[PDB]
Design an enzyme around this catalytic site. Structure first.
Site, PDB file in Angstrom:
ATOM      1  N   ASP D 749       0.870  -1.121   0.064  1.00 10.37           N
ATOM      2  CA  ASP D 749      -0.066  -0.063  -0.083  1.00 10.37           C
ATOM      3  C   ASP D 749       0.742   1.160   0.042  1.00 10.37           C
ATOM      4  O   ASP D 749       0.727   2.310   0.879  1.00 10.37           O
ATOM      5  CB  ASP D 749      -0.842   0.153   1.152  1.00 10.37           C
ATOM      6  CG  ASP D 749      -1.910  -0.941   1.331  1.00 10.37           C
ATOM      7  OD1 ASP D 749      -1.791  -1.896   0.103  1.00 10.37           O
ATOM      8  OD2 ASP D 749      -2.112  -1.529   2.414  1.00 10.37           O
ATOM      9  N   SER D 750       1.949   1.257  -0.899  1.00 15.55           N
ATOM     10  CA  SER D 750       2.957   2.497  -0.990  1.00 15.55           C
ATOM     11  C   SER D 750       2.921   2.777  -2.591  1.00 15.55           C
ATOM     12  O   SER D 750       2.453   2.070  -3.243  1.00 15.55           O
ATOM     13  CB  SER D 750       4.161   2.214  -0.457  1.00 15.55           C
ATOM     14  OG  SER D 750       4.978   3.153  -0.439  1.00 15.55           O
TER      15      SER D 750
END
Ligand SMILES: [Zn+2]
Ligand SMILES: [Zn+2]
Ligand SMILES: [Zn+2]
Ligand SMILES: [Zn+2]
Lengths: 116, 50, 50, 1117, 49, 121, 66
Positions: D749-750
């Site tokens: 989730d980056s």
């Protein structure tokens, strides 16, 4: 059957059932009045443990003009013979078995209801 | 754990007919996320994901 | 006046109890008269954030 | 002619005309306008004349309200900048008639007596901005896009959140398990805008001869049996009773069901013993029987079923209404009628800024009447002719409203903790979709920390009323809710014209009914007052509808519900009923025909409007309880065409189905292609996306504002975000996203950002922080003044550099400032102590503008705001419209990012693993259609349910521009230039930058400030606090067996301290270490002392024990 | 597209099968599963389908 | 778990279930009413049962068949348990297991009218 | 707010095209033919002009003086 409440004629209160311990007959006396009227039904009280009730007694003919409600052309009336009929399940909560469909003739001045 | 409940009287949404137990009438989303959800099944999907 | 001494000791009892327990059942909660209830020594250590 | 499909164009000429007629916050403006125009006058009008030795009568008339004025007209921006309360004086005409002995009365009318300032909601019918043009609003430094609908209280924009509640005047039957009651017929009653709050009634049935029906009248401690209550209404006979409760005696089942309640009451027949019974259950029972009767007589006259009426209506009209409460209870017990769902939204009402304020004005007024009463008493009753103009403590209204709109404590400050809380929240200026959604926000009062799921669940009845997607994922999840785009909250209208109309049309009034008629006759319920019955409900429904479609007798907001199964017509006109417009369907054609569309397309040029669609019987406001009875197509061409018919009996048609979405949810493109929690997460994050939050932001001194440099219009939009005005105040940038794993710094989730894009201004934003400080006369010898401190005289003085600010004592715009720099130099005289204000620690910005003025007190007041350019960095939280969220994990220059055949490097690379578990396929379709839009050269449509759009159609278009039809591309590795073997999905996607920047979150401590009470680190970054090594960490270190690191964390690195304790007892000794002498008072020992390394909080605990008379005698033995 | 045709055919059959189970319940032809109410039988059938 | 051969056949496992599942009259009763049939043989409901058995009022309780059979119950044990439960104040002239209607007639012999409803309830 | 000087993605100067873009739209070029005529080929440059919202024209409605 059942028994209704029959109200006193003087006070319009509720008549209770009482045995005539002299003539050996059921009466209906009042609490407030001294009104003794002679029974006919010989019944005090009933209780349908089955909770068997005919829904067609509760289904009111006005439901036919409900736009919210599915219409069939697959079951015609019996009195008049209309083709159009709305149908629904028993809205009453006593329905865990009754997904049975109740039909109402969609024709004014008829309101014939039946179950198939 | 149950299908979409009748929050309207005997129906899930005003678009459905009373006592419509059919699949889409009770929350069966038949499209895929690539097909996109119909608006009714979009609302049912939201109810479920809540 | 033995009459009033009873009330005086009753009010002293109220203050002293409220010093160590503001939340008596039924008794008025001690307060800073502008609204806020008094944090008794119980409350200083009673629960979470004790 | 009819719309021959091609209907999408027509469908958004409608809607467009709606939002022209009714901008998004209409539900706030109308509520306030109705409060000021009617409810305020209603409250002062219906307050009784005040009277008392002679006695006056004092009476009020024709309440007047001016424009807002400072004492000259205050502009709202001035009230905002000067921290004033934007408000208008309220004046009333007061007639005083004192009369005394000798029959000498003088009715002297005190004209236009000033009662107080009432705060005005902005852009209302009484705001200075009303109807004011965009030119003038800009001249006022106002924003023509700003919606209004909020108050200014001491400079703070305060919105009144619409508070949900159970509908008044409406019977509801509930089963409350875990109680003695099988069923409970609740009612909550209000007759009209009463200063008395709603009075609640219950007619419960005990579950357990069995089956006894009780009643829980108000002000009664016990529970009188109902038959006693009907006898107290004067019905002696068991057949006059039951005629109210069993409308046909032909039903044996209800008869034999009600019998045991009569057997609970047959000891009582006359009304007088019945009243003695009720009076003896009074909460304040009178000693003498007569006072008990009078008390109980009043309760029935005035407190039970007040909506049905009072005084003469008691002994009949509301006897019938109580009979109906019992009847519906019996139906719920026989199961003939289902229980009412407490969370069905037709059973709820919304207290908007009108009723919310009317409640206070009934609370702050009447208080004023008490005040003038006591005043005139003190005076007049001493034969001292009072002046009322001195009696009127105008402070009561002006400060009562100011206070409640400020704190939000909806009640007296004397009793605020007993009141509702957070009714009035600071308007969220963070981004325009946040302002718009904060204004359209509803709130259930249901307790959070209430574990119940059912009030948090998305009920079926919120369709089209409330956004299915926009809810806080926190503890408020499902309690706080949001209006849907076309949802309109009904403002309320008088039923009297409807009652007069229903007196026509052969309606039969309730008090003239022969009760046998009720058996086969529909019962009419105006605002939940049962008012009559009718033989023919197929004519009423068609006529009442026709009249709504003609706007004449019945206003559009009125909702007539026809319950077929139970013969009941319920008509609601009151306020707070959420409703939404629907196209009317007749036969199977729509009434909306090509005439209306053509007329409405030339609108303004012909001054046609949405109001003409309403007043042409073409569209209709339906409300959730009437929505029970509509049959609602969803589009004409879908649902009314001659397929093998589903129903063919549609009464109404959805205008467009995307109008179920609210403000932040309808910015999501393709939301029907996303997993629903992800649409919720976007509805959340969309309230945090930096943008331009309002165009007058250069005038705002908001405490926090984030402004994006280059916010862009989305390359794919819903049509709905036209009306949200998102393309004017957008929040985000369309960036060439690539969904590739690449170097792995985007993994969980980056996102990998392009450093060279950032260098060009990609998502670069500015952060404005405004610091406000004013002056004061602290006391005789104490006074604050803006002044450069000087080490010579200013005694207290920080280690700071005070010379950055000039001799005014104010930093000047354009000066570089950093944390603990001095911003407003301030001295308070004792010589002078330093009292100045310093820039928040590690803030480091430039002074943007400095304003100086006078506050209400006429003290110099200045607000300084400091800007801070926030170039995106690693850790800044980006998100997209599809609930994909992630911190920038690394930034690669353009040379290092992968590149297509042409040198298009991504701007944002997000890891593929974000997609498959989350199924945000709306994100992929956005990227694909954005790539089409950017080549095609116009903005794609992503309106959800638009079957004109599909992925295959987009792919077909995309293939025409010479790209892979699925959006994949061959990328080349930026490091080596080799083609990447997997072709990468790359294309324009609208990203947002959220307020959650990392430099606002990074925090560290190494022996900073300490709390005063327990000498532990302070709490929080702003305080330079230390992180809590909590309980659970304690447990995790016990599991580690890391006792040395547990001792250091829970002691030596927190509150290292020492005590001396006596060896003989364990009470802490006295220890003059300064002379190395020690004693314990109580043993008189000086040698028997030992030092104890001891947590300060432990020392403090033991002293909090000793102060309870507990000796925790610590022993070394 | 062949996969989509198979998927759509499968759903159509499932919808038709649910319609037939509804017909069976509407006609009271749906015998309850032991222990289940007729409604629970119907819901189990539809959920299985 | 079932210990005996009953563990195999569903039939002889069923009677264990009936011996375990709590079954009060409400489960097998259908319709409970009262009648002031002035004599046992008065038989105002037209019944030939008391005449072979040869209070002025009785409880009549027509029970269920498909519920009594499914439990392998009989009027015999029902009447036994009634008379044992309330003592010989109550007499129960039960039907036979050949008739179509599964009536019980219950009378008292030695505030009474409500008392049959009180004991039935 | 104002037009970005360079296309964020690639680098092409787009800050001298906005008034030209709008003038071509006022010649009633279709919206992609305006971009084709300015010389924006890559969709990364095209989304600079298509997406740009020129809020500075609204900010200039507010008066500092006159
Ligand atoms: Zn009588
Ligand atoms: Zn017919
Ligand atoms: Zn000692
Ligand atoms: Zn470019």
């Amino acid at each position: 059957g059942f028994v209704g409440i029959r109200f006193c004629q003087e006070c319009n209160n509720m008549l209770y059932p009482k045995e005539d311990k002299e003539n050996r007959i059921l009466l209906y006396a009042c609490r407030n009045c001294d009104y003794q009227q002679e029974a006919d039904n010989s019944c005090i009280y009933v209780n349908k443990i089955t909770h068997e009730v005919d829904e067609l007694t509760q289904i009111i003919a006005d439901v036919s003009q409900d736009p919210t409600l599915p219409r069939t052309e697959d079951h015609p009336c019996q009195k008049c013979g209309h083709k159009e009929a709305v149908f629904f399940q028993s809205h009453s909560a006593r329905a865990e078995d009754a997904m049975r469909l109740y039909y109402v003739c969609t024709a004014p001045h008829c309101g014939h209801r039946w179950t198939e | 754990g149950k299908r979409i409940p009748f929050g309207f009287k005997h129906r899930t949404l005003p678009h459905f007919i009373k006592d419509d137990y059919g699949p889409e009438s009770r929350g069966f989303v038949e499209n895929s996320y690539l097909a996109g959800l119909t608006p009714t099944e979009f609302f049912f999907h939201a109810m479920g994901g809540r | 006046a033995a009459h009033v001494i009873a009330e005086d000791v009753k009010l002293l009892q109220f203050h002293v109890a409220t010093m160590v327990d503001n939340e008596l059942p039924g008794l008025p909660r001690a307060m800073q008269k502008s609204g806020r209830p008094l944090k008794s020594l119980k409350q200083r250590l009673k629960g979470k954030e004790g | 002619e009819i719309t021959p499909d091609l209907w999408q164009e027509a469908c958004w000429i409608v809607i467009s005309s709606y939002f022209d007629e009714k901008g998004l916050v209409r539900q706030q403006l109308d509520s306030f306008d109705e409060f000021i125009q009617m409810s305020v006058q209603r409250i002062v009008e219906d307050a009784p004349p005040i009277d008392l030795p002679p006695r006056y009568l004092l009476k009020f008339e024709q309440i007047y309200l001016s424009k807002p004025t400072h004492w000259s007209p205050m502009m709202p921006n001035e009230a905002r900048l000067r921290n004033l309360t934007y408000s208008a004086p309220l004046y009333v005409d007061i007639t005083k008639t004192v009369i005394k002995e000798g029959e000498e009365q003088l009715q002297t009318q005190h004209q236009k007596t000033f009662i107080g300032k009432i705060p005005i909601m902005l852009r209302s019918t009484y705001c200075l901005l009303n109807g004011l043009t965009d030119r003038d609003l800009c001249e006022l430094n106002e924003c023509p896009l700003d919606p209004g609908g909020y108050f200014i209280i001491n400079g703070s924009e305060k919105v009144l959140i619409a508070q949900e509640k159970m509908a008044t005047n409406t019977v509801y039957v509930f089963a409350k398990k875990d109680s003695k009651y099988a069923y409970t017929g609740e009612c909550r009653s209000c007759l009209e805008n009463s200063s008395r709050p709603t009075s609640t009634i219950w007619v419960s049935m005990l579950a357990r001869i069995g089956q006894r029906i009780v009643a829980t009248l108000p002000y009664i401690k016990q529970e009188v049996p109902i038959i006693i209550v009907f006898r107290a209404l004067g019905f002696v006979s068991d057949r006059d009773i039951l005629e109210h409760i069993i409308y046909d005696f032909e039903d044996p089942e209800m008869m034999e069901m009600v019998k045991p309640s009569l057997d609970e009451a047959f000891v009582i027949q006359e009304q007088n013993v019945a009243l003695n019974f009720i009076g003896s259950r009074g909460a304040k029972p009178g000693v003498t029987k007569e006072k008990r009767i009078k008390y109980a007589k009043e309760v029935l006259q005035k407190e039970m079923l007040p909506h049905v009426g009072v005084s003469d209506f008691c002994e009949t009209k509301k006897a019938y209404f109580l009979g109906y409460m019992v009847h519906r209870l019996l139906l719920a017990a026989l199961g003939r009628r289902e229980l009412d769902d407490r969370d069905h939204y037709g059973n709820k009402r919304l207290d908007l800024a009108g009723p919310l304020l009317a409640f206070l004005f009934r609370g702050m007024f009447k208080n004023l009447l008490k005040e003038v009463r006591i005043y005139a008493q003190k005076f007049i009753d001493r034969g001292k002719d009072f002046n009322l103009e001195l009696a009127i403590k105008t402070r009561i209204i002006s400060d009562g409203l100011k206070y409640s709109l400020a704190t939000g404590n909806w009640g007296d400050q004397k009793k605020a903790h007993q009141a509702r809380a957070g009714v009035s929240q600071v308007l969220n200026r963070l981004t325009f979709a946040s302002t718009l959604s904060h204004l359209r926000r509803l709130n259930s009062p249901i307790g959070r920390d209430g574990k119940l799921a059912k009030p948090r669940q998305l009920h079926n009845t919120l369709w089209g009323m409330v956004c299915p997607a926009e809810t806080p994922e926190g503890h408020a999840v499902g309690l706080v809710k949001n209006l849907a785009l076309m949802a309109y909250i009904s403002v309320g209208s008088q039923p009297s014209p409807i009652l007069e109309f229903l007196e026509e049309w052969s309606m039969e009034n309730l008090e003239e009914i022969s009760p046998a008629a009720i058996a086969d006759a529909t019962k009419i319920f105006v605002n939940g007052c049962w008012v009559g019955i009718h033989k023919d409900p197929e004519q009423l429904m068609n006529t009442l509808r026709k009249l709504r479609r003609q706007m004449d007798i019945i206003v559009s907001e009125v909702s007539m519900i026809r319950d077929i199964r139970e013969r009941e017509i319920r008509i609601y006109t009151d306020a707070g009923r959420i409703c939404r417009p629907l196209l009317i369907v007749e036969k199977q054609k729509l009434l909306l025909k090509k005439r209306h569309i053509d007329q409405l397309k030339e609108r303004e040029y012909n001054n046609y409007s949405w109001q003409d669609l309403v007043a042409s019987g073409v569209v209709e406001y339906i409300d959730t309880l009437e929505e029970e009875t509509v049959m609602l197509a969803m589009t004409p061409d879908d649902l009314q065409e001659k397929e093998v018919a589903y129903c063919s009996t549609y009464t109404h048609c959805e205008i467009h189905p995307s109008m179920i979405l609210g403000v932040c949810a309808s910015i999501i493109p393709f939301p029907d292609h996303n997993q629903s929690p992800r649409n919720t997460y976007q509805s959340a994050m969309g309230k945090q996306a930096m943008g331009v939050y309002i165009t007058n932001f250069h005038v705002r001194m908001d405490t926090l504002a984030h402004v994006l440099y280059y916010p862009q219009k989305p390359l794919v939009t819903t049509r709905s975000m036209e009306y949200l005005r998102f393309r004017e105040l957008p929040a985000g940038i369309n960036s060439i996203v690539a969904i590739a794993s690449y170097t792995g710094y985007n993994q969980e989730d980056s996102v990998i950002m392009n450093r060279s894009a950032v260098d060009r201004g990609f998502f670069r934003s500015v952060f404005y922080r405004s610091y406000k400080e004013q002056e004061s006369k602290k006391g005789f010898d104490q006074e604050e003044v803006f002044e450069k401190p000087t080490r010579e005289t200013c005694q207290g003085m920080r280690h700071a550099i005070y010379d950055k600010l000039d001799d005014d004592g104010l930093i000047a715009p354009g000066v570089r400032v950093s944390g603990d720099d001095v911003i407003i130099g301030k001295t308070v005289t004792l010589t002078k102590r330093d009292c100045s204000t310093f820039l928040r620690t590690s803030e480091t910005g430039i002074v943007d503008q400095v304003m100086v003025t006078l506050n209400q007190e006429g003290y110099k007041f200045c607000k300084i705001r400091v800007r801070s350019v926030r170039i995106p960095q690693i850790g800044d939280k980006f998100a997209s419209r599809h609930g994909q969220k992630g911190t920038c994990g690394i930034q690669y220059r353009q040379e290092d990012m992968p590149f297509t055949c042409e040198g298009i490097t991504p701007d944002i690379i997000i890891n593929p693993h974000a997609i498959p578990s989350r199924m945000t396929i709306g994100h992929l379709i956005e990227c694909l259609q954005g790539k089409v839009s950017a080549n095609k050269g116009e903005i794609g449509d992503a309106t959800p349910f638009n079957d004109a759009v599909n992925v295959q159609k987009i792919s077909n278009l995309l293939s025409d521009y010479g790209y892979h039809l699925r959006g994949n591309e061959v990328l080349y590795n930026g490091f080596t230039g080799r083609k990447i073997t997997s072709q990468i999905f790359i294309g324009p996607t609208y990203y947002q930058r959220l307020k959650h920047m990392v430099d606002d979150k990074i925090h560290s401590r190494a022996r900073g400030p300490i709390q005063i009470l327990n000498r532990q680190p302070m709490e929080g970054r702003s305080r330079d606090g230390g992180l809590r090594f909590g309980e659970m960490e304690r447990d995790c270190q016990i599991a580690h067996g890391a006792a040395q690191f547990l001792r250091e964390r829970l002691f030596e690195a927190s509150d290292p301290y020492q005590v001396h304790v006596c060896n003989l007892c364990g009470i802490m000794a006295i220890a003059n270490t300064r002379t190395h002498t020690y004693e314990c008072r109580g043993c008189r020992n000086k040698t028997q002392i030992s030092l104890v390394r001891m947590p300060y909080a432990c020392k403090l605990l033991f002293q909090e024990l000793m102060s309870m008379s507990i000796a925790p005698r610590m022993m070394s033995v | 597209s062949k996969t989509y045709q198979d998927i759509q055919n499968t759903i159509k059959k499932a919808k038709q099968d649910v319609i037939e189970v509804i017909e069976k319940a509407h006609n009271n032809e749906l015998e309850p599963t032991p222990g289940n109410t007729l409604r629970q039988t119907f819901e189990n059938q539809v959920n299985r389908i | 778990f079932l210990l005996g051969q009953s563990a195999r056949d569903a039939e002889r496992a069923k009677d264990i279930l009936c011996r375990l599942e709590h079954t009060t009259l409400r489960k097998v009763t259908a319709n409970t009413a009262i009648y002031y049939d002035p004599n046992p043989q008065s038989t105002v409901v037209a019944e030939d049962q008391e005449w072979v058995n040869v209070s002025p009022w009785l409880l009549r309780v027509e029970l269920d068949r498909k519920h009594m059979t499914d439990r392998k119950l009989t009027m015999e044990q029902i009447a036994e348990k009634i008379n044992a439960g309330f003592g010989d104040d109550l007499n129960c002239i039960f039907n036979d297991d050949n008739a179509e209607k599964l009536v019980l007639r219950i009378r008292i012999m030695n505030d009474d009218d409500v008392f049959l409803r009180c004991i039935e309830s | 707010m104002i037009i970005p000087v360079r296309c964020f993605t690639c680098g092409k100067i787009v800050g001298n095209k906005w008034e030209a873009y709008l003038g071509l739209l006022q010649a009633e070029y279709t919206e992609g033919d305006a971009l084709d005529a300015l010389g924006l080929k890559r969709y990364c440059c095209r989304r600079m002009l298509l997406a740009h919202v020129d809020l500075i024209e609204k900010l200039l409605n507010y008066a500092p003086l006159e």
